[PDB]
Curated annotation (Swiss-Prot):
The chain holds residues 171 to 299 of 639 of the full protein. The modification Phosphoserine is found at S15. This is ADP-ribosylation factor-binding protein GGA1. Monomer. Interacts with GGA2 and GGA3. Binds to clathrin and activated ARFs, including ARF1, ARF5 and ARF6. Interacts with RABEP1. Interacts with RABGEF1. Interacts with the type-I membrane proteins LRP3, M6PR/CD-MPR and IGF2R/CI-MPR. Interacts (via N-terminal VHS domain) with SORL1/sorLA and SORT1 (via C-terminal cytosolic domain). Interacts with EPN4. Interacts with CCDC91. Interacts with HEATR5B/p200a. Interacts with SYNRG/gamma-synergin. Interacts (via GAE doamin) with NECAP1 and NECAP2. Interacts (via GAE domain) with AFTPH/aftiphilin. Interacts with TSG101 and UBC. Interacts with RNF11. Changing K28A: Abolishes interaction with ARF1. Plays a role in protein sorting and trafficking between the trans-Golgi network (TGN) and endosomes. Mediates the ARF-dependent recruitment of clathrin to the TGN and binds ubiquitinated proteins and membrane cargo molecules with a cytosolic acidic cluster-dileucine (DXXLL) motif. Mediates export of the GPCR receptor ADRA2B to the cell surface. Required for targeting PKD1:PKD2 complex from the trans-Golgi network to the cilium membrane. Regulates retrograde transport of proteins such as phosphorylated form of BACE1 from endosomes to the trans-Golgi network. It is found in: Golgi apparatus, trans-Golgi network membrane; Endosome membrane; Early endosome membrane.
C-alpha cells in the first residue's frame, strides 16, 4: 500500500529501460484491483444501509401498532427483512479479508434478526 506506492513514484521519475514498463504494469495492476475493491465496499455498504433503515422503520411501526392500512405496509416491510437474511449471510462469506467489515455485516444481521422476531412476537 505504501511500499507499492513509494515503489511506483520511483519507477515513474527515471529513465526508460525498466522504469516505464514496470511503472505501467504496476499502474495497470492497481487500477484493476481498486476496481474490485470498489465494487465490494459498494455492495456491502448499500446492503447494510438498506438493513439499518428497514429495521428502524419497521421497529417504530411495531411500536405505534402495539396499541393502535399500515398493518400491510408493516408486513410487506417485514418480509423484505426476511429475504435479506440471505444476502447478509452470503455477504459475510465473501468478506473474509476484513474483520471490521465482516463484523459490521454481522451486527447488521443481529439487528435484522432482532426485529424480524420482534414483529413476529406480536403477529404470533
Amino acid at each position: 500500500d505504501e511500499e507499492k506506492s513509494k515503489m511506483l513514484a520511483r519507477l515513474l521519475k527515471s529513465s526508460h529501460p525498466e522504469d516505464l514498463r514496470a511503472a505501467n504494469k504496476l499502474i495497470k495492476e492497481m487500477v484493476q484491483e481498486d476496481q474490485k475493491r470498489m465494487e465490494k465496499i459498494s455492495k456491502r455498504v448499500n446492503a447494510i444501509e438498506e438493513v439499518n433503515n428497514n429495521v428502524k422503520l419497521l421497529t417504530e411501526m411495531v411500536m405505534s401498532h402495539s396499541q393502535g392500512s399500515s398493518e400491510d405496509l408493516m408486513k410487506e416491510l417485514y418480509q423484505r427483512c426476511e429475504r435479506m437474511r440471505p444476502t447478509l449471510f452470503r455477504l459475510a462469506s465473501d468478506t473474509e479479508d476484513n474483520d471490521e467489515a465482516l463484523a459490521e455485516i454481522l451486527q447488521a444481521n443481529d439487528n435484522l434478526t432482532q426485529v424480524i422476531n420482534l414483529y413476529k412476537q406480536l403477529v404470533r
